[PDB]
Amino acid sequence: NPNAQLIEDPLDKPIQYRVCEKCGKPLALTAIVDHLENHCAGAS
Numbered sequence: 001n002p003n004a005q006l007i008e009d010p011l012d013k014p015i016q017y018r019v020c021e022k023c024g025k026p027l028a029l030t031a032i033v034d035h036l037e038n039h040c041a042g043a044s
Ligand SMILES: [Zn+2]
Pocket: 020, 021, 022, 023, 024, 035, 036, 039, 040
């Protein structure tokens, strides 16, 4: 029986990244939304 055994749910999702043109930080597709929302124009 799996008492301490964990059958890990496969996360076969490579998350893509791009740097934010104005901030310069690498944004993953998972974080693009919250970053884009909270980011400031002129963030340096
Ligand atoms: Zn940004």
